[PDB]
Amino acid sequence: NSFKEGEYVLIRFGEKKFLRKLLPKQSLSVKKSVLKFDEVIGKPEGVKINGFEVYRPTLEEIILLGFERKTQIIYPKDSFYIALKLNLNKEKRVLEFGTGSGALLAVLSEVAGEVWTFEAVEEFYKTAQKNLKKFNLGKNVKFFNVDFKDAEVPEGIFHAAFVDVREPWHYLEKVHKSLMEGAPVGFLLPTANQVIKLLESIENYFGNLEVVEILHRHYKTISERFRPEDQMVAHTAYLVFGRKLKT
Amino acid sequence: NSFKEGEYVLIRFGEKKFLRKLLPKQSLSVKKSVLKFDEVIGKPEGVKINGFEVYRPTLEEIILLGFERKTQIIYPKDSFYIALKLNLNKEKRVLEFGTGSGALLAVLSEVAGEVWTFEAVEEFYKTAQKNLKKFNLGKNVKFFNVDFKDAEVPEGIFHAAFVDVREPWHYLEKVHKSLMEGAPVGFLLPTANQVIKLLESIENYFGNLEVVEILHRHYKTISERFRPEDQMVAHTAYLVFGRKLKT
Amino acid sequence: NSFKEGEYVLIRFGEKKFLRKLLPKQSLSVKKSVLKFDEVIGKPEGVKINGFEVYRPTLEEIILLGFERKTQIIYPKDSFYIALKLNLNKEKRVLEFGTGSGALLAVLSEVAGEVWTFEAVEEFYKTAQKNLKKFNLGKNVKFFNVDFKDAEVPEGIFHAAFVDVREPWHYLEKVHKSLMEGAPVGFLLPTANQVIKLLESIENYFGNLEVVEILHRHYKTISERFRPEDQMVAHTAYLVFGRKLKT
Amino acid sequence: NSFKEGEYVLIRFGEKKFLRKLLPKQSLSVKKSVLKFDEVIGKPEGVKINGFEVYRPTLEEIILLGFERKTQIIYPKDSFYIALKLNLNKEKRVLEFGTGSGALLAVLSEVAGEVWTFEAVEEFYKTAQKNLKKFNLGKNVKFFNVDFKDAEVPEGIFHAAFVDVREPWHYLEKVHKSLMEGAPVGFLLPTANQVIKLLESIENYFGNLEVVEILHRHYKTISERFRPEDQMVAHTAYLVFGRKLKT
Ligand SMILES: C[S@@+](CC[C@H](N)C(=O)[O-])C[C@H]1O[C@@H](n2cnc3c(N)ncnc32)[C@H](O)[C@@H]1O
Ligand SMILES: C[S@@+](CC[C@H](N)C(=O)[O-])C[C@H]1O[C@@H](n2cnc3c(N)ncnc32)[C@H](O)[C@@H]1O
Ligand SMILES: C[S@@+](CC[C@H](N)C(=O)[O-])C[C@H]1O[C@@H](n2cnc3c(N)ncnc32)[C@H](O)[C@@H]1O
Ligand SMILES: C[S@@+](CC[C@H](N)C(=O)[O-])C[C@H]1O[C@@H](n2cnc3c(N)ncnc32)[C@H](O)[C@@H]1O
């Protein structure tokens, strides 16, 4: 299959990546160098045109460059670890809230058998849906435009849960009840205060606790001057993991 | 889903995790405290017995505590990112060599639809099969006890490839040939020397180059004394990613 | 400059450093390889005997390998930054408490013109003096065996202060008074809880606030296999810096 | 002593530091907020006016915000560790080249008793002098405008050396000869290629080898949302340290 028009492509030029829809007679220009989308439409993946390499985007590239952000997203750095740390596969059901823009959801969807997501704000609920539908994702996802505390969530049936909210300690009882015995949970908390607060509240519900931070550092890809890049993302969030306690 | 005899359990006591097979009359003793396995048979996951929390192990815990190591392994820190970075799902076929102890393979197998894996050393080839089989994994894996260079491999059948060998640059042409157009490739390299050498020749075959290292720092999960651990894994390997260029 | 009987030497063997007194008739053995100290005495610095390289220790090696530890110490990774971040030189007077084992003191002493140090525990007060004198350090230091709250400290004579105690917020007013206008202050705090607590109480005393953590990753020094070490120190403490606000 | 006109002051407003010369009638605007210098002149350090805190700058702030950069500089993160790692004090003479903009020099000058620095490029030689002079530094520094290879330097008179050039391996024999027995040496190298090459070259001249990289992560200083900053400096350089081997 060759490059069709109207489809989103990943363009590499120098150190930088670009995501662009292949619309006729439109172009990408970067520092005097021009790539015309008309020369791309009809070519295979991995073509080199005037210094521009063109491919179809991966899941990581789709999330980072394709997804509209109406809220703070969970980056692949974290979500690629989270999905598999939650011990997910195609035999498993996972609970997520809040959906936000669907950045974590896209990864949970790709790994798990079934996802139930909850998002209180209607705008973000529509945005996450749009994001995933746009890139052919989320066919195993049930979206709910409701506050998790008000939702009717089937008790004792989820193989895992992941919580991304400001104050997750207000939802611990219900999350606990939604899960199967011994099931993994994960929490995303940007702040140390939130983590301390969650650790104060979690003891009745989840054991085998783990808190981890993930750092990625990229390197220059030039052979003769191999070294780390000048800057890196320093922090996205503390990741909190546990396992359901019987009670 | 209560604990049955002979099955593997993950035990947490204090800061430590233990993986133990549930054998009759046998026990686990740490710092005086004893956990008798007869007392855990018939109990649900997330039961707490004498300060010991017991669960079934996750994929990460299986790899780290359960897999027999005849070689250096690829750690979940890296492999969880690798599997999804390579854009894998159930519709994808992935190439891997060398199999080694099967630690990366276990993750590839869970994420991908199909894996072809090559290991030249017979005892490593046997250990990898034993590792995954012991934990009910690798049902979608084709194991080959041959040097990849001698293998009969149809061209353009792989949606992704991952290479973990001392000198990957010798295999670039065959891997490129075995991949479908524009397909992701990844390389595991422990030393900067290897990365530098790979970067000399790689651009004849693969573009959209990325080199990243992944660091995990774990935290004390005590609410009142929240802080990072004393020590961490500093380095496992440099990860280099690319995409098949059309030749 | 030849090695004398009884002096402390830094011995390097393979990847490892050793600090030893040059005692006659004595030896160091590592992996069945033997260094005889009689062969070292009377030799120049930087001799190599039986694979062992022998030098006089530096400030960092003295603190790390030579100082007796009765308390948690401040490591050179932090202390080398701290002393210069506090803007110390030979025309500066610095306040420090608690002295502990004198590990930070050694650095403050080397950089600043004079140091007033306070330690409430007399066993620790004595150990710190023993450490420093043993290695010909601390001639510019006034040691006090007193609680800092009870100490007779002249107001406005200190160019900087550093506080290493469990609950530094109790002593803010007195440290503030002891400091010259706009003078730098630093705090060492192992936990996030402690930093959060100091930050809410420091508001009316110190401004230009900074919190930093310092990570050192070491590398293999083998040319053909250049890569980071397997393990590193993950955390020592958060460092909090401010400047005296005029009240 | 209150602020005088013509003084360079450190101004803190929100998260940002500013270094400005106190010019009468002049101001600093941060968006719509204004600080009038006429209100600062005649006031003590640590004064707060309309949200702006004003101090005199420390060595770190002088280097980072005050020094004119005509080369790549060595940052305080590295130089503060370097100066004390080289075991410098007021009884030590240190060799340095190339001087560059004088950022490392300022620190060596503050710590050592005497510095001999060499810079081949006349412009940078003048820049380094102008930088230190402007902030009342470097009175113990001998500046030379010459290639180190061509300079007449007394044998065995340096207690330490630091080398910041592209290819330091060329100067090893001379640096070695200029050093006292057992003396520390340091090298700054941006790339792994350079480190690899130096390690290949250094074996006959320097032992007790160490390679380290230093990372600083800064934190939000808001009590109720304590977390690391979003971004950090990922890499400045690899730091190589050794000790003179007897030849
Ligand atoms: C930081 S965003 C989640 C980002 C998401 N993980 C991603 O990767 O894009 C937090 C979201 O949770 C939603 N939320 C907060 N509390 C909720 C609740 N009680 N029930 C359902 N959604 C909630 C908010 O509306 C917000 O959109
Ligand atoms: C470091 S181990 C791989 C570890 C594995 N990735 C894991 O996670 O457990 C590398 C293995 O590749 C094998 N190997 C090297 N070259 C090979 C080749 N050309 N074909 C097949 N196997 C090869 C070696 O026998 C060795 O066991
Ligand atoms: C962690 S140790 C300091 C270690 C020291 N910075 C070093 O490098 O070796 C803390 C010390 O502070 C002392 N201390 C606590 N409160 C004090 C106070 N109010 N006045 C004097 N010393 C105090 C304790 O006795 C203890 O020795
Ligand atoms: C990276 S800059 C030095 C930066 C300096 N360490 C600082 O902190 O500002 C390298 C300098 O070394 C100088 N240089 C290179 N080779 C030299 C040599 N053989 N003798 C003297 N200077 C040399 C260059 O002119 C250049 O200014």
Numbering used by the authors:
A (entry chain D), B (entry chain C), C (entry chain A), D (entry chain B): 2 to 248
Could you share sentences copied from the article?
In thermophilic bacteria, this modification is important for thermal adaptation, and is catalyzed by the tRNA m1A58 methyltransferase TrmI, using S-adenosyl-l-methionine (AdoMet) as the methyl donor. The methyl group of m1A58 is transferred from the methyl donor S-adenosyl-l-methionine (AdoMet) by the TrmI homotetramer in bacteria and archaea, and by the Trm6/Trm61 α2/β2 heterotetramer complex in eukaryotes. Therefore, the m1A58 modification of tRNA is important for stabilizing the L-shaped structure and for efficient translation.
Here, we report the crystal structure of TrmI from Aquifex aeolicus in the complex with AdoMet, determined at 2.2 Å resolution. The asymmetric unit contains four protomers (A–D) and four AdoMet molecules. The A. aeolicus TrmI protomer consists of the small N-terminal domain (residues 2–58) and the C-terminal methyltransferase domain (residues 72–248), which are connected by an α-helical linker (residues 59–71). The C-terminal domain adopts the typical type I methyltransferase fold, with a central seven-stranded β sheet with the topology β9–β8–β7–β10–β11–β14–β12, flanked by α helices on both sides. The methyl donor AdoMet is bound in the C-terminal domain of the protein. In addition to these four hydrogen bonds, the adenine ring forms a T-stacking interaction with the side chain of Phe98, which is fixed by π–π stacking with that of Phe149.
